[PDB]
Design a protein around this ligand. Sequence first.
Ligand SMILES: Cc1[nH]c2ccccc2c1CC(=O)N[C@@H](Cc1ccccc1)C(=O)N(C)c1ccccc1
Ligand SMILES: Cc1[nH]c2ccccc2c1CC(=O)N[C@@H](Cc1ccccc1)C(=O)N(C)c1ccccc1
Ligand SMILES: Cc1[nH]c2ccccc2c1CC(=O)N[C@@H](Cc1ccccc1)C(=O)N(C)c1ccccc1
Ligand SMILES: Cc1[nH]c2ccccc2c1CC(=O)N[C@@H](Cc1ccccc1)C(=O)N(C)c1ccccc1
Ligand SMILES: Cc1[nH]c2ccccc2c1CC(=O)N[C@@H](Cc1ccccc1)C(=O)N(C)c1ccccc1
Ligand SMILES: Cc1[nH]c2ccccc2c1CC(=O)N[C@@H](Cc1ccccc1)C(=O)N(C)c1ccccc1
Lengths: 215, 215, 215, 215, 215, 215
Amino acid sequence: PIVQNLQGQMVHQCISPRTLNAWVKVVEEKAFSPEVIPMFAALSCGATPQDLNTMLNTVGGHQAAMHMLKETINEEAAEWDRLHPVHAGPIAPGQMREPRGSDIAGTTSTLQEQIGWMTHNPPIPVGEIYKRWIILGLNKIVRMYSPTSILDIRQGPKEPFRDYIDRFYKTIRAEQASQEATETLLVQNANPDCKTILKALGPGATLEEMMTACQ
Amino acid sequence: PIVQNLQGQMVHQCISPRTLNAWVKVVEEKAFSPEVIPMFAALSCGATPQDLNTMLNTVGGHQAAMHMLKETINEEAAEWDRLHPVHAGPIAPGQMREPRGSDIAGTTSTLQEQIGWMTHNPPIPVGEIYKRWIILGLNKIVRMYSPTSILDIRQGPKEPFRDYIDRFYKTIRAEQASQEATETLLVQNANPDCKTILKALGPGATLEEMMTACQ
Amino acid sequence: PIVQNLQGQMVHQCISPRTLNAWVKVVEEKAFSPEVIPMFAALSCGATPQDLNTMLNTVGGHQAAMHMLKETINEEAAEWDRLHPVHAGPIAPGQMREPRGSDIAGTTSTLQEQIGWMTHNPPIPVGEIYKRWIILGLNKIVRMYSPTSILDIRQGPKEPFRDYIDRFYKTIRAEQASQEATETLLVQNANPDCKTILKALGPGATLEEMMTACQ
Amino acid sequence: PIVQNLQGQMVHQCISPRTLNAWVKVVEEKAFSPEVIPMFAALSCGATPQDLNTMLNTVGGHQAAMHMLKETINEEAAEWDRLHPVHAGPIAPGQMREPRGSDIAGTTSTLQEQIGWMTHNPPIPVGEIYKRWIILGLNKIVRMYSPTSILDIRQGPKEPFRDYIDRFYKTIRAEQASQEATETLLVQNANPDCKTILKALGPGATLEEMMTACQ
Amino acid sequence: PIVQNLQGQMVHQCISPRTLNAWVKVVEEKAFSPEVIPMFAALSCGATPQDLNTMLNTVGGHQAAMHMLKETINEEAAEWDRLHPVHAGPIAPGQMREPRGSDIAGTTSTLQEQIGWMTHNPPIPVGEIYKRWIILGLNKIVRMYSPTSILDIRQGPKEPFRDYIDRFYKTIRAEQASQEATETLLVQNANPDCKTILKALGPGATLEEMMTACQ
Amino acid sequence: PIVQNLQGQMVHQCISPRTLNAWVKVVEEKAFSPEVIPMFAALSCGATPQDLNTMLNTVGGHQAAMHMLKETINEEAAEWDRLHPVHAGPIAPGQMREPRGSDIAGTTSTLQEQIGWMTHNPPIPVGEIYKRWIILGLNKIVRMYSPTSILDIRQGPKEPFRDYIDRFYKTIRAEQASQEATETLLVQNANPDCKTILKALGPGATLEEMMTACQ
Ligand SMILES: Cc1[nH]c2ccccc2c1CC(=O)N[C@@H](Cc1ccccc1)C(=O)N(C)c1ccccc1
Ligand SMILES: Cc1[nH]c2ccccc2c1CC(=O)N[C@@H](Cc1ccccc1)C(=O)N(C)c1ccccc1
Ligand SMILES: Cc1[nH]c2ccccc2c1CC(=O)N[C@@H](Cc1ccccc1)C(=O)N(C)c1ccccc1
Ligand SMILES: Cc1[nH]c2ccccc2c1CC(=O)N[C@@H](Cc1ccccc1)C(=O)N(C)c1ccccc1
Ligand SMILES: Cc1[nH]c2ccccc2c1CC(=O)N[C@@H](Cc1ccccc1)C(=O)N(C)c1ccccc1
Ligand SMILES: Cc1[nH]c2ccccc2c1CC(=O)N[C@@H](Cc1ccccc1)C(=O)N(C)c1ccccc1
């Protein structure tokens, strides 16, 4: 990544063994549960495009997902080039060239070039731009791997209301990849006894009040 | 987070893998036992609003609780805006804008803006303000998930007094989310034999003296 | 905590995840065995009162003990105020106020105020003063939870002398919370065969010589 | 490795116990699954040739693979010498000598010499050149150890499409050591029921659309 | 401990959680096997007397050993005072006082005083002096807890020579607490068949040659 | 060890708990498998002779090996003294004395003296010289503990060629302690069916080609 040192200058640092292991382990343990995305975002803080590829490449399983991600990345890179045409020809000696999509994704740019862009004034934040494309792709994967429609999250006869709502909002998060009348659906999908109580509370009731009421 | 370096300047640092993992693990192991809150507060030392959202977002379970927390945050943000109206219109070029509720909660502000506020002189401590809203919400969740009324904590016939008092004060802490005649209730809820001894001690007895007496 | 940086200035640093976890784990594994106290003292090196409360608050069990500790802290704070009366009224603008007991215990003081006192010249060491009150309270808890009188530590007929003395001095440590004719009691509580040998050695024998003799 | 310090100078640092252990453990757990290569590349960030040999030498198993790697390294070193002949004879006193293949591979060069080349202006990046030779060799090993032809990855009658595609693209990655009408082969190797659905989608369908269709 | 910072000045640093845990764990796992002593010496690198007491105090078991250690420390402290009499009376204002035995052992000196001595020019190395007394005491404990005389280490009829010599030199190390015609005793204690071979080798044979011969 | 700080000066640093534990654990898990030596070399990067003795002394088992190592060290030290006679008599006040063998091995030199030599200009690299003697001794131990002659590594009738070659080159490494017509022996020791195939390939075949051929 690129970070500021003790002196107060933006410099390249090697990706740490702890960061590398943390990412590999969260994917192994959580697959593409929605909470994997903010972990990725946090673990890749200050990442160069090279670092982002490193993280994605260290993942051993889920190769269908990784292929889908590559497709998303390629789509975002093509769109970048459409919006930002770079002039062809030889580079001005010793000067910074303009990044293409494939340079942002780290396929055609060097670490040195990436550092050059990210530490320029003003910065051309290729790490952040690429991370946005990656997260866009990861959100599609999260939605793909969400196993259940919210329509099928219904409270069991003996299921505690707390456990039901945990399943309900877990499912909403996966189905929408953490992107924000669900309270109405929550009541509709509740079991008969809790549903009666929730109807009596009326509209405008908070989740807190509903939980208290069916507790 | 924002910390002071070796040179003595307040700078942004990436949230560490160790911090991220620690928070995820304490929630996995302790759910919303009262001691989770001071751990959150300590692990989020110097946190930007972005960091606070990262920590909350890395939590995979407990989505009913997280939805309740969002409601609390939205309430505190609306109240902030009522007390602190920001003037609409274009920003003075190159100048710091005033934070709205949604900027404090990190939904409408950038990391750069957050850094700007928190390192300004004087600091506009958006990380600390948001953390206060979050802890307020977490305390409600702790009280919600407290499984037992203090009225139902009673010493068993063969239960050691020490074990009884551990249950008693554990329950008080959960019921009040660690926010401070309970000594009287403690005696009332004691078993017959210990209760007789505690009555003989009289009023003004310390917990230490009571424990000695029923030991 | 407050520490000196590379440059050589006393600055605030966030309490580390490793420190937080270490304290929580030693309490989980050792409860209030005497060796927990020096671990607490070492892990809270340079701690502000806020840090000390953080450490105590992260403990989930042992709430009877924690309530006893609060009583000790309140007693020491009242005594502080009796010995050190602070003048009431408005503070001199921009000047350091005098700490009351509740400020030392971190209930009525801010982190900024705590930093101000601890880094003043000369320092008003509120972290160290509070830690002393806490350790005083923890020592009472260690003595409370010591399960056995030294009178009941007696060598078994087939018990190796080494194992007996380990139990003996372990018990002395707990009963006195590591605060320093026990050699005589050690002999009295020894089994018949070892006792005869130890009597023959006579007075002035070291523990080393006694162990050799009954080995 | 060679890294830049807080002051902003390129200096040698000892390889860390965490780096050493991470590499040894990933080889123990993953052997030569394709994802081992980008982990190697990341863990050897800034590595001197000495560091690269250290990492390779700490591996206890897989000695057939390590012998193959040595052969690749020797081939790349011979080619280097063919392209870059070094003038024989005594060195100019106190001056930098030109690296031969065996100097790049760290068999005939000292750490001091390696540091000299890598921190020269311009740098003669012997660590990076050697790492390229090593990765070239590791890719051959990955392809050697790939256990299955893509021709034999076929969807089972009851196998979920997601699981089939995971096997498919895992195999492509191994067979090509992560070096980029497979969508056509993917359809051909699908089971009858999914194959019919995929034919109806027609050409130009994304993996995402195919997965949706056979989900 | 006292260490030199990045700037190059000798300053106090808090003992680390990793150091504290390492010492506690090595004692738990190895008791007073001889190799515990050099681990103690290494983990207490740069330790103040306060740090040394912290390490010793964090040990929960082995209280007979710890009492023996205290006796050794008290003996060494009395001898220090005999050799180095300190002048009684009031201290020169703002000046360094001379350390007594109890000051070196950290019972009557403050951390500040300890820092003062250890960073003075020339340094009065109270940490190193105390560590010497402690190691002297630990060596006595190692010898006390050595379970077997070298006279009873004899090669079994079917015991491999390598395993026999491991037991032999392990025992010598414990019996002498790692303080350096044992080759003759090694032969005498060997089994008949190996003994015959070793006699044929004659005198002046190395351990290496003996091992080869009975292999 | 001796390392360069942030400022760029060579200073002593305490050996880390992580380094100490890593070495102890690799010996516990791997004994004297050949890969232990490069781990030792890497973990002792920048080590003083004191540090090297610390590492060797923290090893609890394998005392026969450690005694053999001491013999090798004593041999190398005697040879050093033969080649480098030091003038006897009093030292020039405040000046650096010349290291003898026993000073290089850290038996008769202080840490201060060791630091003096290693940071002198030019450096007298006593840490590196001693490490060379130690590795020479460790290589002898690796060869001693190598359990099998390469003559007895033969491919089983049903043993996969890959597994056979792993055993073959593992054995060569141990027998030669990683110090570099074995391809011919590899073929001779192959099973009948693979041997026939390998003969047909002819001379000059790479290991890669042989593996392919018998795969
Ligand atoms: C955790 C979660 N569950 C969801 C369900 C549907 C849609 C989105 C989500 C999210 C992500 C989610 O909304 N996370 C929150 C942070 C958060 C997490 C957990 C509790 C409270 C606040 C967030 O990122 N932002 C910007 C936010 C902050 C305050 C209010 C609203 C949004
Ligand atoms: C741990 C605990 N149990 C409770 C029961 C009811 C209400 C609150 C609580 C708390 C939190 C609790 O009160 N924690 C204490 C710190 C503490 C923790 C444990 C032992 C001693 C001191 C705290 O945060 N503060 C500010 C405090 C400090 C001194 C006296 C009184 C309060
Ligand atoms: C460990 C222990 N057991 C005890 C039994 C009764 C009373 C107190 C204790 C203690 C604490 C205990 O006395 N710890 C010792 C340090 C120590 C620990 C272990 C072995 C040697 C030295 C200590 O803190 N100090 C100041 C000390 C130092 C030297 C001599 C006497 C006291
Ligand atoms: C992970 C993987 N599977 C493959 C199958 C066949 C050939 C190569 C591969 C690779 C390596 C692979 O291609 N990894 C990607 C990074 C990556 C990994 C995972 C998901 C998305 C992006 C990479 O290194 N680069 C340079 C890249 C970046 C964007 C688009 C295309 C390539
Ligand atoms: C490890 C060990 N076994 C012993 C048996 C009897 C007496 C002492 C011991 C020791 C401690 C022991 O002697 N350790 C060695 C270091 C060492 C450890 C292991 C192998 C090689 C060198 C040591 O500390 N020093 C100063 C030393 C160095 C070179 C030669 C002789 C002594
Ligand atoms: C790992 C190994 N197996 C052996 C068998 C017989 C003799 C020696 C060995 C070694 C040590 C071994 O040779 N290790 C290699 C590094 C290495 C390790 C593994 C794969 C590729 C390169 C090494 O240290 N050097 C200097 C080296 C580098 C390039 C070519 C030749 C030698």
